[PDB]
Design a binder for this molecule. Structure first.
Ligand SMILES: Cc1cc(Nc2cc(N3CCN(C)CC3)nc(Sc3ccc(NC(=O)C4CC4)cc3)n2)[nH]n1
Lengths: 269, 48
């Protein structure tokens, strides 16, 4: 049914940084959305035809309050249009840049929310493979929205080999070229938790090469001011051996997460 | 020139409204149809 003409454009979002993304709303109902416009020529020129399909199928299959919703897509002769959830508080990375770091309560809340979303993802055999601050948007009450699915994969077998993600967040088993499973996501939750509380990622260095070596050695250095409960959580997630890592169900029950999380569920009905 | 609905207090109020009065998304947006790459342009990962 839906086409470009069923929407009124409000304003551009992100100043080109994220492509052609607009605040918009349905003309009839005034329901507010982010409309993302892709030029087919540009998709073909970058040979991203198959990545587009993948991203849409995965996003279509995921309905969770902490996962940015894809309502639908459509296309004309010249363009592909994604109808995405509008996240009105914007980018966590911006929020993080105000204070360069987050308090225990805001961090704990994000951790609980990611462990919940990723429980839902893994139960559907989706591995994200690129959890990090810059992939997260913020809802009306500050609730995390996993917003980028560029490296995501639907794998019933939970067996993959491809190098994916972002240097400071790469898990050791990927760097080692091993077969890996859903536990790559647990590693990234640990890196994220560290970065939100400290202001920088735990394996950061002047070169790609030195970062790789820090990761393989699990060279985590906690500042003295790091709260004790967060230190515990992070050390239990940043494990060399994937199966030794704290599982999502134990993340949710971790005393530090329990104590400091103030997670709210979006209304319904 | 940014439409009046898309900034200031009118956007805030509409955001508040939408958040606490969620609509029926199905009847608003319909089913998501399988992506046909041939029409758009010209493994285990599809077994859900
Ligand atoms: C897709 C999306 C984006 C949003 N919301 C926003 C909101 C936002 N704001 C700017 C800052 N004010 C204070 C709040 C609103 N700035 C951006 S700038 C921006 C634009 C796009 C993306 N991400 C993507 O387009 C990826 C997911 C496909 C991230 C940030 N995006 N809701 N849904």
């Amino acid at each position: 049914r839906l086409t470009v003409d069923d929407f009124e454009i409000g304003r551009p979002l992100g100043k080109g940084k994220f492509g052609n993304v607009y605040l918009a709303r349905l003309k009839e109902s005034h329901f507010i959305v982010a409309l993302k416009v892709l030029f087919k020529s540009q998709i073909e020129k970058e040979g991203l035809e198959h990545q587009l399909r993948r991203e849409i199928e995965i996003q279509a299959h995921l309905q969770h309050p902490n996962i940015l919703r894809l309502y639908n897509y459509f296309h004309d002769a010249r363009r592909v249009y994604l109808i995405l959830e509008y996240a009105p508080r914007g980018e966590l990375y911006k929020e993080l840049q105000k204070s360069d770091k987050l308090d225990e309560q805001r961090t704990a809340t994000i951790i609980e929310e990611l462990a919940d979303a990723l429980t839902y993802c893994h139960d559907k055999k989706v591995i994200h493979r690129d959890i990090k601050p810059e992939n997260l948007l913020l809802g009306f009450r500050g609730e995390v929205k996993i917003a980028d699915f560029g490296w995501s994969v639907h794998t019933p077998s939970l067996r993959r080999k491809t190098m994916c993600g972002t240097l400071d967040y790469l898990p050791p088993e990927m760097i080692e070229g091993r077969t890996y499973d859903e536990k790559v996501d647990l590693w990234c939750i640990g890196v994220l938790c560290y970065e939100l509380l400290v202001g920088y990622p735990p394996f950061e260095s002047a070169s790609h090469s030195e970062t790789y070596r820090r990761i393989l050695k699990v060279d985590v250095r906690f500042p003295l001011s790091m709260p004790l409960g967060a230190r515990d959580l992070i050390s239990r997630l940043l494990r060399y051996q994937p199966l030794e890592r704290l599982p999502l169900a134990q993340i949710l029950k971790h005393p530090w997460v329990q104590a400091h999380s103030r997670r709210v569920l979006p209304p319904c009905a | 020139p940014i439409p009046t609905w898309a900034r200031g207090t009118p956007l805030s109020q509409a955001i508040i409204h939408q958040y606490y009065h969620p609509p029926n998304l199905l009847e608003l947006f319909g089913t998501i149809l399988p992506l046909d790459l041939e029409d758009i342009f010209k493994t285990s990962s599809a077994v859900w």
